[PDB]
Amino acid sequence: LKKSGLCYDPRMRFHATLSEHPEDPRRVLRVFEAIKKAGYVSNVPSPSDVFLRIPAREATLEELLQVHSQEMYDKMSHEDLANLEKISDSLYYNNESAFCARLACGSAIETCTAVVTGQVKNAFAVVRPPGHHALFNNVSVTARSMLQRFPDKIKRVLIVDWDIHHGNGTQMAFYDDPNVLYVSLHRYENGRFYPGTNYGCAENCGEGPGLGRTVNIPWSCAGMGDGDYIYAFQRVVMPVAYEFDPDLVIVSCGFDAAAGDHIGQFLLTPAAYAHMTQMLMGLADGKVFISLEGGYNLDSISTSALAVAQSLLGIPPGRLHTTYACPQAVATINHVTKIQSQYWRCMRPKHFDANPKDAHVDRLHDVIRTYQAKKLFEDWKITNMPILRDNNQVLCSSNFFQKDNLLVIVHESPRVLGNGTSETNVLNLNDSLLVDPVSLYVEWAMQQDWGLIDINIPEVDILSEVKELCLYVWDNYVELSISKNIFFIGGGKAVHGLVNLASSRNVSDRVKCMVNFLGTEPLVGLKTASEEDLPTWYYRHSLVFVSSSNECWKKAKRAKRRYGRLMQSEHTETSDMMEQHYRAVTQYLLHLLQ
Amino acid sequence: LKKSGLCYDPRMRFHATLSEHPEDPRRVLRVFEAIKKAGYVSNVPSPSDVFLRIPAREATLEELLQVHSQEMYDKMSHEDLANLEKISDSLYYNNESAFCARLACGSAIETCTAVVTGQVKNAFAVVRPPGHHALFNNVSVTARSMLQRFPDKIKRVLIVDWDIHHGNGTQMAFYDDPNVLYVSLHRYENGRFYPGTNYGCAENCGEGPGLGRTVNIPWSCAGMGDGDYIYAFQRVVMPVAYEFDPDLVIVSCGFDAAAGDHIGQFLLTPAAYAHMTQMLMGLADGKVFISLEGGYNLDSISTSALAVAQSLLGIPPGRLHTTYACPQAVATINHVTKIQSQYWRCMRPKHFDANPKDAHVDRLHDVIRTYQAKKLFEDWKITNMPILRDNNQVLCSSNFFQKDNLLVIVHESPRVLGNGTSETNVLNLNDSLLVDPVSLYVEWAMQQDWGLIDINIPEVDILSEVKELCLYVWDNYVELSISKNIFFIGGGKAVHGLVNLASSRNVSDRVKCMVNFLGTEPLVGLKTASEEDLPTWYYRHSLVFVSSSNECWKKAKRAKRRYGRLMQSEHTETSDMMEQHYRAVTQYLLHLLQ
Ligand SMILES: [K+]
Ligand SMILES: [K+]
Ligand SMILES: [K+]
Numbered sequence A, B: 001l002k003k004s005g006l007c008y009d010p011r012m013r014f015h016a017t018l019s020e021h022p023e024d025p026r027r028v029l030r031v032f033e034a035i036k037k038a039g040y041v042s043n044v045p046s047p048s049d050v051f052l053r054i055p056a057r058e059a060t061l062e063e064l065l066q067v068h069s070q071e072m073y074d075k076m077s078h079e080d081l082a083n084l085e086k087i088s089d090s091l092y093y094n095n096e097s098a099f100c101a102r103l104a105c106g107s108a109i110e111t112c113t114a115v116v117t118g119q120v121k122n123a124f125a126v127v128r129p130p131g132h133h134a135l136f137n138n139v140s141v142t143a144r145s146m147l148q149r150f151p152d153k154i155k156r157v158l159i160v161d162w163d164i165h166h167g168n169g170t171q172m173a174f175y176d177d178p179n180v181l182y183v184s185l186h187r188y189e190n191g192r193f194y195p196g197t198n199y200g201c202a203e204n205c206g207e208g209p210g211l212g213r214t215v216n217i218p219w220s221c222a223g224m225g226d227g228d229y230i231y232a233f234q235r236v237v238m239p240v241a242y243e244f245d246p247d248l249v250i251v252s253c254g255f256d257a258a259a260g261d262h263i264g265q266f267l268l269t270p271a272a273y274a275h276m277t278q279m280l281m282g283l284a285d286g287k288v289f290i291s292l293e294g295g296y297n298l299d300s301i302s303t304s305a306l307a308v309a310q311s312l313l314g315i316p317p318g319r320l321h322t323t324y325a326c327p328q329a330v331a332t333i334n335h336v337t338k339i340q341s342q343y344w345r346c347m348r349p350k351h352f353d354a355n356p357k358d359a360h361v362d363r364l365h366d367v368i369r370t371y372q373a374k375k376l377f378e379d380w381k382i383t384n385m386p387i388l389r390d391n392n393q394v395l396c397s398s399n400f401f402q403k404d405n406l407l408v409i410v411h412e413s414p415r416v417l418g419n420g421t422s423e424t425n426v427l428n429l430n431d432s433l434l435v436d437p438v439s440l441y442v443e444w445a446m447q448q449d450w451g452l453i454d455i456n457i458p459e460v461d462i463l464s465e466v467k468e469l470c471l472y473v474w475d476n477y478v479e480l481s482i483s484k485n486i487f488f489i490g491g492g493k494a495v496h497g498l499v500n501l502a503s504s505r506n507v508s509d510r511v512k513c514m515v516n517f518l519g520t521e522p523l524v525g526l527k528t529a530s531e532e533d534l535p536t537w538y539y540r541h542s543l544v545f546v547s548s549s550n551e552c553w554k555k556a557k558r559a560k561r562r563y564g565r566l567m568q569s570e571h572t573e574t575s576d577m578m579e580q581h582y583r584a585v586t587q588y589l590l591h592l593l594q
């Protein structure tokens, strides 16, 4: 059983000389101390230590010139030639902090070499550069160096970057390179978060030969945690890594996504870093190299770094805080999957696109409503109810205005269940189903010889359009009808239109009941100055079906009449409410007519 | 760093006495020898061995009575009481093979105990019972025993069964138990494969409290391999395991799914077993217990068992043979995901169902075609072309029969791109798109003032209906028309109808060209006795667009005229062929009219 490698050269006394090294020198000190306290390493290196001590190194000028030059060798371009002045000033500049730059760069190469040569199973370099956190960086220099020196063993390198910041430099260094896969999880927020570039967006997958060898997972907000990252690793990172089949894994291992870090504002516990490390160790014959990066909380760095070290040694990881991925996270991973399905066999289903502006392309919203309008005309002579504004959105039965009883149904679009091959988003039209419970009420209303009006609510402010359309239909058609007994059945966001109608018009005379199948819509009530009369009427002339998981249960203290008569439903979806409460509701409205 | 456990008690001399022990005694011998040859264990157990030797044990009568009885204790039922006669005959029956039953059962409990108590990190029991492979079995007895003896540490047990046979007994023993999660990958084939029961189907998820705590992955055929199993582990097994959060992992570790096993006929290499083991070791604080089970090839058992042992010791696993999952496998995992999304947060999207027999439920096939028929009537007065048989399937322009030029388009249903929340199979009707390139030709044909006929092919023998419908339309409408210049445009399986038409009717007179956008449909040609005249005509009056990945390229030797003039297309899908070749094809057909 091979030992793991550990490179550490703090130089605390030398670091006490520096003034005006933004890098905190006690960062590496705290990491080493935590590993030592656990008993994995000693101040005096012993053959009993499970960590093999690897001596730190200074990167030489000739060494670094080879990296920048040999890759150019592997058509010719003068602007692509190695520049001695620039390469030198990065290694030997005026300030004495230059020593740390040389030591950090060289030690990364030396430590990773110990892994590639098989001297150790894996390694952890705890040697930091002087400059700020977030011309090749250490990870890039190391990656390129291994590909060059050991071409018979290393032909593909995987770079996993789980620092909360996107590595612009690392990505750009291999953006055209197909043999180096760069994977990055980072806080993005539409490119607002540091470095504030759009370069780390999900759409950037590489270019030229390196197309499909850059994978970005840009989180859209703060507060991501254990479940979110393990979710991303199980659904994206590990499947892609297995397909890439790397010969070497290098981790840009920052800890500013850890709980306690005030900059990153994420909630990763040490166990998350232990699990991620352990997963990666299944790759590349175990050849994993950890490079210490960012982090702003010494305690978070200490505990998280210990967890990473423990996984390298084969110590079992702890229990995750949670395996629950929040909606923002899964939406991000869905977006990533759609993009990445173009380049990776394991990312499915493949997402095909089309332009609604094209003449031969139509949104299903219009397709479904047109179908309904056609079916209803053939069966009942139901026709379009015109809405003057500055088609088939509103439908009505013939001679609806001459019936004693009138039903007005206000609903969002129907349920359509998409089924087919799970290889793409193309649907099987035989197995895909239109589920239209509203039609049960339409059918029923016609059988009773009631007048009927059917309003289809539009989808993506939006409530403004819903409220106005309900008022329009009321003022222009329902109000001017003969019906003595008017009924309303609402679905979802239709509730906003109906309660606003009851608050804006004198409906108490002719409206006998207002049913509302909320579904996943949060409960809302009347908004009126009428303290007594109106809220009492609404409560006595309504049925508001609520699920056990409605948002009104998170602060369920107020029992107001203006919320209407609340009714319990077993079903969370509006569609299921309408279908299942169909019998009970229809019979209830008939009995109201006596 | 804790050692791993190894229990081994071959008793070769005792086993030489048995005659007429179906279990092959050299099974355990080959496993131990392979581990020893690698240098992980010695004949004379040493403190230097990375495997700690755990002494074998006989299961006692009182011990086993506690298991069967204590679970009954944890309402009352006489038929649920422990029976002393049965429990005894299983441990002490007449034949001397009884000793092996006691030794195997006791050693499993002892070995697993060493893991739970933390004496070892993990363990591998290499002690086998006498009976055939595939009243609690060893895995079940062990699982229940740990839950009973160490209730403060073990409250949830995960059982992973990757023997190719379903463990009917294990499943049935915990089917109502929510604290024991049973996961099984097995060759099923509609319950034809041994044990030949439907008990291992994907739909059986448990019952009572144990509902949602049984997960079956039933492979539908032979030949599953590395990519298929790692696919199943990444998409199903590990996500569910992480959500269950077991305190102990027990592996029913059979090797009859290994390459070389003539019974299982699967292709798992040793690396697949190494990777699966390594993944599971991330769970339950590393508390993993391997129980040796089935396998019919001693060499396959030897190499695969070595791989499992190596993972327990923390040795990096080898490279997989492939990460490619075959269509049968992904279809199985899709099926599993749909079922399991009812009980597990991590299995998404949730699958909702509906009954097309219901009056308010319609298949999208009919919805889309009805929409097309409506849109075309409003725009061009295109109407239904009746098909007498013992609606809107066939559409035609008004006075199509009085035009000099006539276009007949034969097509499968249009492309519909399903988009929305990836939490369910419910579609967002705003983002979901109907993509109908056939309408480009319809529009174009009307602009040219050509006659038009549009035939929609049905979906799921099936080719019989396609061929007959084409002949019907020809004999009844196209044949009897005035058009001197007839054109055919086919899509997908429509090719079968068009080539059959050219072979069954005298089309040489009036038909000027027959276009076919194959897409993913394999190339087919004429089937006629006419050796010269007909195949020559078809070649000179056709355009057959073929993708680079058509099935005709796997044996592409014959260049026949009866296949038609083959044309190259960049696009694999019929829909993309029609849209992209639209300009070139329309202009080509116009030039034919001179
Ligand atoms: K990153
Ligand atoms: K790259
Ligand atoms: K099994």
Ligand SMILES: [K+]
Binding pocket: B174, B175, B176, B177, B178, B179, B180, B181, B182, B206, B210, B213, B214
């Ligand atoms: K169970």
Ligand SMILES: [Mg+2]
Binding pocket: A355, A356, A357, A358, A359, A360, A361, A362
């Ligand atoms: Mg359009």
Ligand SMILES: [Mg+2]
Binding pocket: B355, B356, B357, B358, B359, B360, B361, B362
């Ligand atoms: Mg139906």
Ligand SMILES: [Zn+2]
Binding pocket: A015, A021, A023, A025, A100, A128, A129, A130
């Ligand atoms: Zn320094």
Ligand SMILES: [Zn+2]
Binding pocket: A133, A134, A163, A164, A165, A254, A256, A294, A295
């Ligand atoms: Zn950072």
Ligand SMILES: [Zn+2]
Binding pocket: B015, B021, B023, B025, B100, B128, B129, B130
């Ligand atoms: Zn035996």
Ligand SMILES: [Zn+2]
Binding pocket: B133, B134, B163, B164, B165, B254, B256, B294, B295
């Ligand atoms: Zn078996």
